[PDB]
Protein backbone atom coordinates (compact mmCIF):
# COMPACT_ATOMS: atom_id res chain seq x y z
CA UNK A 1 0.00 0.00 0.00
CA UNK A 2 3.21 2.27 -0.27
CA UNK A 3 5.30 1.49 -3.34
CA UNK A 4 8.97 2.20 -3.51
CA UNK A 5 9.59 2.52 -7.30
CA UNK A 6 13.25 3.75 -7.23
CA UNK A 7 15.07 0.84 -6.09
CA UNK A 8 15.96 -0.35 -9.19
CA UNK A 9 15.47 -4.01 -8.30
CA UNK A 10 13.70 -4.55 -11.09
CA UNK A 11 16.06 -3.74 -13.46
CA UNK A 12 17.97 -7.05 -13.57
CA UNK A 13 16.89 -10.87 -13.42
CA UNK A 14 19.10 -12.44 -11.37
CA UNK A 15 19.66 -15.86 -9.92
CA UNK A 16 17.23 -17.10 -6.67
CA UNK A 17 19.95 -17.68 -4.48
CA UNK A 18 21.27 -13.96 -4.45
CA UNK A 19 18.19 -12.40 -3.53
CA UNK A 20 17.48 -14.94 -1.06
CA UNK A 21 20.99 -14.60 0.82
CA UNK A 22 20.89 -10.81 0.12
CA UNK A 23 17.29 -10.90 1.78
CA UNK A 24 17.88 -12.75 4.63
CA UNK A 25 21.60 -10.94 5.39
CA UNK A 26 19.70 -8.20 5.83
CA UNK A 27 17.43 -9.04 8.13
CA UNK A 28 14.47 -10.19 5.80
CA UNK A 29 12.45 -13.25 6.38
CA UNK A 30 10.20 -15.35 4.04
CA UNK A 31 6.36 -15.28 3.83
CA UNK A 32 4.32 -18.32 4.74
CA UNK A 33 3.48 -18.86 1.81
CA UNK A 34 4.89 -21.45 -0.19
CA UNK A 35 4.85 -21.06 -4.24
CA UNK A 36 7.62 -22.59 -7.23
CA UNK A 37 6.39 -19.28 -8.77
CA UNK A 38 6.81 -16.78 -6.01
CA UNK A 39 8.39 -15.91 -2.85
CA UNK A 40 8.23 -12.88 -0.66
CA UNK A 41 10.60 -11.53 1.73
CA UNK A 42 9.22 -9.01 4.47
CA UNK A 43 11.15 -6.53 6.99
CA UNK A 44 9.23 -6.25 9.85
CA UNK A 45 9.23 -2.96 11.17
CA UNK A 46 8.01 -2.34 14.95
CA UNK A 47 7.22 1.22 15.65
CA UNK A 48 5.38 3.62 18.17
CA UNK A 49 2.05 4.11 15.54
CA UNK A 50 1.64 0.34 14.85
CA UNK A 51 4.27 -2.96 13.67
CA UNK A 52 4.58 -2.51 9.74
CA UNK A 53 6.32 -4.97 6.90
CA UNK A 54 8.38 -3.65 3.80
CA UNK A 55 7.72 -6.30 1.36
CA UNK A 56 10.02 -7.41 -1.57
CA UNK A 57 8.03 -9.85 -4.10
CA UNK A 58 10.32 -11.98 -6.65
CA UNK A 59 8.86 -14.13 -8.71
CA UNK A 60 10.37 -17.17 -11.23
CA UNK A 61 11.12 -16.21 -15.00
CA UNK A 62 13.32 -19.54 -15.94
CA UNK A 63 13.43 -22.64 -13.69
CA UNK A 64 11.08 -22.98 -10.60
CA UNK A 65 11.85 -21.24 -6.93
CA UNK A 66 13.77 -21.94 -4.80
CA UNK A 67 16.39 -23.35 -6.92
CA UNK A 68 19.22 -21.54 -6.25
CA UNK A 69 19.78 -21.04 -9.93
CA UNK A 70 16.46 -20.07 -10.81
CA UNK A 71 16.22 -16.78 -12.40
CA UNK A 72 13.82 -14.40 -10.48
CA UNK A 73 12.17 -10.81 -11.46
CA UNK A 74 12.35 -8.64 -8.58
CA UNK A 75 9.18 -6.23 -7.92
CA UNK A 76 8.40 -3.08 -6.85
CA UNK A 77 8.51 -3.02 -2.99
CA UNK A 78 5.57 -2.29 -0.92
CA UNK A 79 5.37 -0.88 2.61
CA UNK A 80 2.19 -1.96 4.27
CA UNK A 81 0.65 -1.23 8.02
CA UNK A 82 -0.61 -4.19 9.72
CA UNK A 83 -4.19 -3.92 11.21
CA UNK A 84 -4.66 -6.32 14.12
CA UNK A 85 -6.77 -8.45 15.07
CA UNK A 86 -9.18 -7.37 12.52
CA UNK A 87 -7.64 -5.74 9.05
CA UNK A 88 -10.32 -2.84 9.75
CA UNK A 89 -8.87 0.55 9.39
CA UNK A 90 -10.37 3.08 12.25
CA UNK A 91 -8.26 6.20 10.97
CA UNK A 92 -6.67 5.68 7.45
CA UNK A 93 -3.18 5.39 6.71
CA UNK A 94 0.10 7.53 7.18
CA UNK A 95 3.42 5.99 7.09
CA UNK A 96 5.50 7.64 10.01
CA UNK A 97 8.88 9.32 8.28
CA UNK A 98 11.16 7.02 10.47
CA UNK A 99 9.67 3.77 9.01
CA UNK A 100 9.53 5.67 5.33
CA UNK A 101 13.45 6.35 5.97
CA UNK A 102 14.11 2.80 7.78
CA UNK A 103 12.54 1.34 3.97
CA UNK A 104 14.92 3.48 1.79
CA UNK A 105 17.88 2.41 3.79
CA UNK A 106 17.34 -1.02 4.01
CA UNK A 107 16.40 -1.24 0.03
CA UNK A 108 19.15 0.78 -1.06
CA UNK A 109 21.94 -1.64 0.74
CA UNK A 110 19.39 -4.28 -0.69
CA UNK A 111 20.13 -3.32 -4.09
CA UNK A 112 23.75 -2.58 -3.16
CA UNK A 113 24.00 -6.39 -1.55
CA UNK A 114 22.47 -8.07 -4.85
CA UNK A 115 24.69 -5.47 -7.46
Given at each position: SLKFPD???????????????AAKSLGFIHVDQWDYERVMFDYKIVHHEG?????????AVKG????????V????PILGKYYYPHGVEYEGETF?????????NKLALLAKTIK
Open positions: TGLEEKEVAFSIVNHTFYLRVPAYEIPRPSTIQIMTPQAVIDKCN
